[PDB]
Structures are given as C-alpha cells and as structure tokens.
Design a binder for this molecule. Structure first.
Ligand code: XAN
Ligand code: XAN
Ligand code: ZN
Ligand code: ZN
Lengths: 451, 451
C-alpha cells in the first residue's frame, strides 16, 4: 500500500500524448502520490530532491525512489471491450462467423457462468491475466447474471484493476435458457449500478450499461436504459455494425429506423460515454451520427478478422474526429493482450491500405496511442489516464525488453553497422513483445502485478 | 547423442497428414531409431514391448522410454523462407514497403554481416531462437558473402537444425557496397554448394541456390545458376510477385518476357525444387507455369501485411495443386515463429474471404498443415518430414499447454458447462501459444533444444 507515501519513479518513460507521436523521456523522474502524478522532470539528477523541491512539507524519509538500459515505463493499456465471461472460449470458434458463434459458443458459456464457482475462477483468471499483459483499465461485458456481475465488480475492486463492469441486457432473440424479460433486465441493471456505486464504492470500479446489441434489446428496454443512463450519467457499451448478417437482422428488426446506428440513436443510447464496439460497416451517415453524439469506438481487430466480420476503417473514423480505442473482444478475439490487439490493428490497417491508400495505414506510434490514450478517450478518462502527465493516474507498466524469455532481442552493436533508435526499440517490443516483457503493473499508483 | 539407442516416445501425437485433417493419437507409442520413426502404435500399453516386438534383436536395456495431460508431440515447424541475416531488423521497417525497405534496412544489415563476429552472433541467435519456437527445418537466405554463408552452414550443422543455406546472388541493381559481379556470384555459389555438400557433409544441412529476385540477377547469372541447378540437382529459392512496384520493375527490366514468373522460367530457375516466396500478385498464367514446373510457394503473411505487399491467395494456389508452406520471412516479417506465421496466415485468409467467399478461409488444421507438411512439400522433403509416420524423420516438438508462463489456459471443468474437444485444445495453442509452450525440440531423433 503506497497511500500516503511519496513515490518517485526514475528512468525512461514512453507514452503517446498525441496521435502519431511517441514521446520518449530518458533519465526522467515522475513523482506519484496517492495514485496521482505530481511532476515529470526530464534530466533529473536527484529524484528525491525533485520531490522535496515539489513539496516543502516532505523530508527525504517520506520519499520512496523506484529505479527503472533495456527498460522503460509505458502507460497501462486500455481494453475498451472484453467479454470476461467468454474467456474459456478463446481460440474456440472454428469456421463460424458472428451469429453462429453466438449460438454455438457464447450463450452456452455465458449461461454456464451463472455458477459462481466457475465465474469466480474465470474472473480471477482474466483480471490477473489482463494485468499481466499490462491492461490497467478494461471495460468488461459480463453476462445477464446479476450475482456474477457483482462478483466481477468485487474481485476487480479486490485485485486493483481499473474497470467498467457491465451486466449484459438481453430481453429479445436469445435462447430461453439465456434471456431476461424487460423488467428484470432493466431492474437488475439499476441494481448493479447501485451496488457498484454505493456498495463497492471504489474509484477504480465503475458501472456501465450494457445492451448487448440491438437484436437482443427491445425498444422498451433500450428507452428505459437510456433514461437510466441520462439520469445517472452512466457509461454505455454495445456492439455496432460488426457483421453483415447482423446488420441485415437489425434492419429487419427495426425497419422504422434508418440504420443500426439510428436504432441506438432513436432509443437514446448514443452518448458522450457510449463505447461502440467494432463499427466496421458504418455508412457515412452512421459515422456522422456517432461523431455528433460523441461516442467512442472500440476497435477489435482480432475478432473482426477471426470471425470474418470485416475491416474497421480506423483511419476513416479518426479522420472524422471520432475517438478510437482498442478492444481485445474476448473471446471472439483470442488474446487478452492489447499489445497483441495493437499489432493486429497495425496489420488490419495495411490490409485496408492495400486497396485504399497508404493513408489508411496506422503507424506503430498510432497503434500504441490507440492502445492507451485512445482507449482513455473512448472511456472519457483521458484527462486522468493514458499518459505520464501531471494530474493523471499512475496507470503504468514496466517493460523490460530483456526480461527472462524475451523475444525482444538486441545485439550490443546495435545500441559502422546500423544502430537502433529508441523508436526502433519500442517497435521491436510492439511487434515481438508479450506479457513476459511486462514485469510490473501499477494502477492508481499501486503495484497490482509482479512477474 | 541418441544414435544407436532405440527410443520410444509415449503420449499424445498430433500431426496433419492431409490438408484439413488434424490427426490426434492419444496413448500412442512412436519408436525412433537413429532419427527415423520405426513404428506408430495407437493404444500402446507397453512401449518397451512395442520395441521388442518390432525388432527381436533388441532387449529391454536397448530401449529408452520417453514419457510425454496437457501435452502432446507435434511435428517440427518448417520455415520455408527466412533471411537469418536480417534478424537484427525484426520490427524495424516503419512505413516502408518492399523496395524502400530493401534500400533503407536490408542491404545495410546484410552488408554489415560481412563482419564474422556479428554474423556468428546473429546466426547463433536465430538458429537457437527458431529452434525454441519449434522450427526444425528452415530455408535460410543469408547474404552475398561466401565466408559468412559457410559459417551459417557450419553452425547449423553444429546446433542440429535441419537447414537449406543459401548464399544470396546479386549482380545487378544493388548498391556498390553490396553487390557482386556475375562471375563472383556464380563461382561463390558453386563453392558454397561444394563446401556444404563435400566439407560440411551433414544430412541435415543442404545448399540452396539463391538468386535474390529477378531485378538483382542478370540473364547471364540466372542461366549459369540454372545450369548448376540442373547438373547438381540443387534446391532453388527466390522471391516472386511480392509487391506491385517490384512487379513493374521486373516488367521494365525483362520486357522480352511475359511476366515475372516467365523471367524465372525462361532463364531456367523454375524446378520441382524451386521455393518461390510470396507469390501474391500472380496472374492465372503465372500460377499455371508454377504448377507445370512443380515449384513450391513460401507464404509469408506477416511480411506481406507489414510491408503492405498484398494478400497471398493461398486457397487459390492450393486449389491449383501448387504446394504451399509457411515462411517467417525475417526480417520483413518480425517473428521467428511459424506458429505466429500460421496464425497470420489464418487471419490473412479471412481478409481475403471478406471479399471473396468463405472458400478462401484456412482452418486451424490447414494452417498447421501449412506449418509442417506444407513446408516439407515445398522443400520436397515430405516423404521424410512433416508427420509422425514410419520412415520419416523424428523432427518434433513437445507442446505443454501448461508450461510455465503459458497463455494457453484451460479450466478443469472444461476437460453441464461446455467442454473442450482435443481439437479445441490444439486451437487454443494455435492462437495463444508461443515458444513458452515448446519445451523440447528434436531434429533427426536428437534433442536439440530444451526450455
Ligand atoms: O464481438 C462480439 N462479441 C459478442 O459477445 C457479441 N454479442 C453480440 N454481438 C457481439 N460481438
Ligand atoms: O520479403 C523479402 N525479403 C527480402 O530480403 C527481399 N529481397 C528481394 N525481395 C525480397 N523480399
Ligand atoms: Zn464483443
Ligand atoms: Zn524474403
């Protein structure tokens, strides 16, 4: 417990304050107190003194120095879309696309998690594992089950991860064994919001209203949830425009609306704090509504490729001023790692570019931005998360490119044969790094994970 | 050294004898003697006796049992295309596409490896690292340097990996600091072939004639190499139809030919043992020539995506009877892992499918096939490699899905909540496995790697 203890981290700090830039600050001291960054001084020669200089009420005994060659601090990753409840099925989907995959794998496993023993095991695994890949903040879709969603929020609080925890709402078009009625779906959402806000009462743990997607939610349910969302100022997360059959289904189910996006817009679910997952097949008009309502987009490339859903036009969305983050979308996406997700966003943008132009391509720096600040923007937490800056939360991971077992190698003579830049080193971690390189993770200035 | 020692491996054996099938043999004994599989008996109750039954000249003392829950044997991966010399640059390529990437990164690093100290370090790293990812057989492009190519072949022999080692030939369109003249390029190829065949004299180490690609090789050089290849019955490897600017360049450079493929065909380099890397933008006519000449194709998805080269139409090539393997294509591809390569081949086939049909999609089983047998077919070694079958080489890796640090998790209750098949377990390793799950590697019935 670091609360009340003035921390100063010294070393190399890497982050992405603006899309496309990679800020590398060597020999830098970052002061952290009660989870908040108090100063960032480049070329610190005296980290303790940097603290004493910052606050004269401090003495050397009040300061804890943390000493970071091959190693840097990077912001915690933000996973804007993760069905923790589906984790048992990562890698398991065969040749299926979305709607068959829902029927065959997802409703079965989500229902199975009504058993608290299974859920508790799954939740502990996924929180620990995403932490070990550097994910400090995650928006979790759970299941329709109230009790298990509360437990997920409890264990999130316990383990120190920053989360939004959603009870999934489904009152239409689900199997009888895995469906709610409208009143239950709404009221259990009210309860879960209350329990998280008033009982869990933890700044790291937030509720999020989770209409599964338009085919699963009646007009009445969506309007009720929308009123809850407006009155209680709650985040929202749902899927949008992922798969063409899904899109056709939505059109068939809501012919009074202009588009899938218009369904959510008309029944009140598009807000500054709505996280829209996938958003592949959007029309220009749909993207314009999303912009006007200031919703954020969770880009889930692994899922989109594995389910043959399509290619998210990330550049096209960014070019319109829509904020974009990354989501693992477990389990449609097999990986718990936003780093892995980032690498695939990089690849997906190039499949697009092969037919569009180079413009569609995302750089390493941009994907890392999406993996951190982008997600914070989507969650509307970018004033407090995503970069090493004064006032922001110390959500951070230590990256050691020479941690044991690392696939990120560098030869001494790279650091007149060609030499690596600092940017190159970051790119080697981006492409070949994994959890083994994330050796420590901090959330809110607390260490929550140690390799 | 296991030579002269009758080995029997007992456990679960997974392999892909035919495209699309995943053969899982539990409680199976595989007898291995002097690198060759002698029997495969499903439901072995007595592995020692299975050996005594196989060969009455044996006694219990002559038999060494190797005992494999979460673990199976899988064939060693085949990397049909790897520029070991470019390894220092994995992850390093920025926004570049092929021709800029050659100029900016590849010729510089390849030239740098004329320094034997650097090369020795690189070769030891890459052989050890590809072994640790389960790559038992690899076709290596080195550099134009004779001495370093010999060393690569020496260290390959020393470390136990099965390799084809190519001295790169370039006598045109290269920078003055990294080019050969025609006579040197040919004669150093003759020498390297001789040195490998007659001095290294190791069944695991083979030469391979390596014209870099058509723009780098004069008509005279190609014809000389073609005659060498015919007279000495040597493998060939080159790049084909990777990047549209490259393709235009070839057309401009060889306007007397009908196509890029026709350049290699006319000057004699298309043979049953020619490994053609990439082969993205082939016309129907080009693919037909490749079929008629019985060349194999190295599919290098990571490179193809990272350099925005395009999407290899793997299904379309397979549908024509052309054999396809996987290649990492270090360093245009950042990964040394054919497993990683396989996962990306899986993804690339789905980007294709999004616009073609489901037909273009590769299953998990098919990618694993490409990763093993496919590569063996491309190298024309599939009678002796790629599967656990009698007469074939014991090129094999032990996969432990619960090795330390594994990202392949399974809950006990997955092995009435939904249960995993054996195929599902393999798919979880396919999508979330990495080198940490490859705990032992055997080449030619010798253990060459231990985690
Ligand atoms: O990627 C997704 N995962 C899901 O569980 C889901 N449900 C509806 N739509 C969905 N998309
Ligand atoms: O993927 C590739 N890597 C290379 O070094 C190369 N050279 C020519 N063409 C090439 N393609
Ligand atoms: Zn989802
Ligand atoms: Zn290559």
């Amino acid at each position: 417990d670091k609360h009340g203890k003035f921390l100063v981290f010294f070393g190399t700090f890497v982050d992405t304050p603006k899309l496309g830039e990679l800020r590398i600050r060597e020999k830098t001291s970052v002061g952290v107190l009660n989870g908040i960054i108090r100063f960032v001084n480049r070329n610190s020669l005296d980290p303790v003194k940097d603290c004493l200089d910052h606050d004269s009420s401090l003495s050397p005994e009040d300061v804890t120095v943390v000493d970071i060659n091959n190693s840097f601090y990077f912001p915690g990753f933000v996973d804007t879309h993760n069905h923790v409840s589906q984790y048992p099925n990562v890698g398991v989907f065969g040749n299926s696309t979305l709607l068959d995959w829902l029927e065959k794998y997802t409703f079965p496993i989500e229902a199975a998690l009504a058993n608290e023993n299974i859920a508790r095991e799954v939740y502990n695994k996924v929180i620990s594992k995403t932490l070990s890949h550097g994910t400090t903040t995650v928006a979790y879709y759970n299941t329709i089950d109230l009790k298990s969603t509360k437990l997920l929020a409890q264990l999130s609080s316990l383990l120190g991860q920053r989360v939004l925890v959603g009870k999934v709402c489904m009152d239409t078009n689900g199997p009888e064994y895995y469906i709610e009625d409208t009143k239950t779906s709404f009221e259990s959402t009210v309860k879960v919001v209350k329990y998280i806000r008033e009982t869990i009462c933890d700044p790291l743990v937030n509720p999020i209203v989770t209409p599964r997607f338009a085919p699963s939610c009646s007009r009445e349910l969506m309007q009720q949830l929308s009123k809850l969302v407006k009155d209680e100022n709650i985040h929202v997360q749902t899927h949008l425009s992922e798969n063409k059959e899904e899109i056709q289904w939505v059109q068939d189910l809501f012919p009074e609306c202009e588009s899938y996006t218009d369904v959510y817009d008309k029944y009140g679910l598009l807000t500054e704090k709505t996280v829209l997952a996938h958003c592949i097949h959007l029309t220009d008009a749909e993207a314009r509504v999303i912009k006007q309502r200031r919703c954020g987009i969770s880009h889930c490339p692994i899922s989109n490729s594995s389910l043959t859903s399509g290619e998210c036009r990330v550049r096209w969305l960014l070019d319109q001023g829509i904020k974009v983050g990354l989501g693992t979308d477990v389990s449609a996406g097999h990986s718990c790692s936003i780093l892995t997700t980032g690498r695939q966003a990089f690849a997906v943008s190039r499949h697009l570019a092969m037919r569009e132009t180079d413009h569609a391509k995302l750089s390493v720096s941009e994907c890392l931005f999406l993996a951190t600040m982008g997600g914070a923007q989507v969650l509307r937490m970018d004033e407090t998360l995503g970069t090493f800056d004064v006032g922001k939360q110390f959500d951070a991971q230590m990256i050691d490119t020479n941690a044991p077992g690392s696939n990120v190698d560098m030869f001494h003579w790279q650091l007149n044969p060609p030499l690596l830049t600092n940017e190159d080193i970051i790119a080697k971690w981006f492409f070949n790094g994994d959890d083994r390189n994330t050796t420590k993770v901090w959330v809110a200035g607390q260490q929550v994970y140690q390799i």
